[PDB]
Amino acid sequence: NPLFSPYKMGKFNLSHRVVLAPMTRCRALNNIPQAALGEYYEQRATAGGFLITEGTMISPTSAGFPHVPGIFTKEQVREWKKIVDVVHAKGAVIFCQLWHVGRASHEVYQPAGAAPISSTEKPISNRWRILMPDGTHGIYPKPRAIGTYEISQVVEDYRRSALNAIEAGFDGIEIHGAHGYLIDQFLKDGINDRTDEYGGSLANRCKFITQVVQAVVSAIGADRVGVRVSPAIDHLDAMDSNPLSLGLAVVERLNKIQLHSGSKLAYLHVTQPREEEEARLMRTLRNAYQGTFICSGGYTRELGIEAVAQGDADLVSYGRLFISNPDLVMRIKLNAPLNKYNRKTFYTQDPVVGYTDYPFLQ
Ligand SMILES: Cc1cc2nc3c(=O)[nH]c(=O)nc-3n(C[C@H](O)[C@H](O)[C@H](O)COP(=O)(O)O)c2cc1C
């Protein structure tokens, strides 16, 4: 089984290729990590296994979901440390995903009911709806288009949160630059309509992600930074006219950051729009990137084995199957049946129901 051949992810010696994909679960009440997160991540921790946390707030303006954790406060750092400890107690490697939603928010999630921030003043269309704190679905508002100074301050929020994650004991961080959120709102020419140095050309559209990644690299070292992108996923009206060139332009700047800093990133992480043409886009981005590649999106045990065996990826991250199967790594090793996941409790607040009560194998 190629999923269980060991892999050297830079400085981290992983024992298998099964990764916990980052998943927002909304149990971090009041943006503070709760003990429930500790039990949840510990249930899925394995010796030499790689975990990525739910999207974590870098700022008071970075949320678009309820009860999502942050790492911009000393209290959040203090509470994240107890979770990192129980995870490292089982020998797992864990990264904190740094998440800013951009325009994918609502006044209910913003301090003083302010408008969310974005590259543009264009809102998400009402084809998409935002989960409200009360379980209803609300309307995405008009965002505020920020100047270049405010762009540099957001880069600083990424930089400070990366240092906070290291203080909490995380082995590294993942930059969430996918799924139509803040960074992707700069990348995709379907969203980025700016006429300054952050809009227009493909080079200008990649400036924001380059500056974010360079800032966390120089802060904690390239070998502790992962980067997640999704060029071909139109989530939240996040289309690009040339998804492959967009992905290749992004990949090239990661390669240059590695050459500049003289060190390789932890990995590049790409979700795919889960047909053969979409598989070719992943392999094209894989072949272009000088380092570790993590593939994600609709993967199974068989597709994951097939990805690693054919060189399509070095690591495979699983989302929904990891919700319902805490011992997904053990089940996949034994080729044991997988349990179904409850969609209704993906984003609920209960610290147990649909979060930690999925049973292990008999
Ligand atoms: C409930 C849920 C929450 C998710 N939260 C995040 C997130 O916070 N950040 C992120 O980059 N991806 C997030 N994802 C996407 C996953 O990281 C991953 O791309 C996806 O689950 C892979 O598809 P799979 O379920 O077939 O494994 C989430 C997915 C689900 C189902």
Q: Tell me, what CATH number does 36's domain have?
A: 3.20.20.70
Helices (H) and strands (E) in the chain, counts: 11, 14
On whether 102 is known to bind a ligand per the annotation, the reply is no
On whether 67 is known to bind a ligand per the annotation, the reply is no
- Best residue among 24, 56, 99, 323 to mutate for probing ligand 1's pocket (most ligand atoms within 8 Å of CB) is 24
Catalytic residue flag (residue 341):
no
Give how far the C-alpha of residue 322 lies from the chain's centroid of Cα atoms, to the nearest Å. 15
d(CA 114, CA 352): 33
> Burial of 336 by CB count in 10 Å (0-12 exposed, 13-18 middle, 19+ buried)?
middle
CA of 164 to the centre of ligand 1 (A): 23
Count of structural domains within the chain: 1
Catalytic residue among 40, 181, 299, 318: 181
d(CA 55, CA 100): 8
CA of 168 to the centre of ligand 1 (A): 23
Closest residue to atom 4 of ligand 1, CA basis: 23
Name every residue whose Cβ is closer than 8 Å to that of residue 208 and which is 6 or more positions away in sequence.
Answer: 119, 151, 155, 183, 186, 187, 198
Q: What are phi and psi of 223, to 5 degrees?
A: -70, 0
Residue with tokens 């071909």: 232
Q: Could you tell me the resolution of this structure in angstroms?
A: 2.3
Is residue 97 within 6 Å of ligand 1 at its C-beta?
yes
On whether 297 is known to bind a ligand per the annotation, the reply is no
Question: Which residues lie across from 20 on neighbouring strands?
Answer: 51, 318
CA of 101 to the centre of ligand 1 (A): 14
> Burial of 235 by CB count in 10 Å (0-12 exposed, 13-18 middle, 19+ buried)?
middle
Q: What are phi and psi of 157, to 5 degrees?
A: -65, -40
CA of 169 to the centre of ligand 1 (A): 23
Alpha-carbon distance values, 121 to 36, 72, 117, 273, 328 (Å): 38, 26, 8, 26, 42
Q: How was this structure determined?
A: X-ray
Q: Return the percent helix, strand and coil in the chain, to nearest 5.
A: 40, 15, 45
Closest residue to atom 18 of ligand 1, CA basis: 319
Is residue 55 within 6 Å of ligand 1 at its C-beta?
yes
- In eight-state DSSP terms, residue 132 is P
In this structure, what token pair is assigned to residue 329? Answer: 């790594």
77-93: b or e for each residue (b if 16 or more CB lie within 10 Å)? bebbebbbebbeebebb
d(CA 23, CA 294): 15
Nearest to 4 by CA among 305, 317, 321: 305
d(CA 103, CA 88): 35
Is residue 299 within 6 Å of ligand 1 at its C-beta?
yes
- Best residue among 23, 37, 97, 176 to mutate for probing ligand 1's pocket (most ligand atoms within 8 Å of CB) is 23
List the domain range (segments joined by +) for residue 130.
1-362
- In eight-state DSSP terms, residue 108 is G
d(CA 71, CA 84): 13
Is residue 49 within 6 Å of ligand 1 at its C-beta?
no
Closest residue to atom 5 of ligand 1, CA basis: 23
Alpha-carbon distance values, 180 to 119, 167, 176, 204, 223 (Å): 11, 29, 10, 17, 26
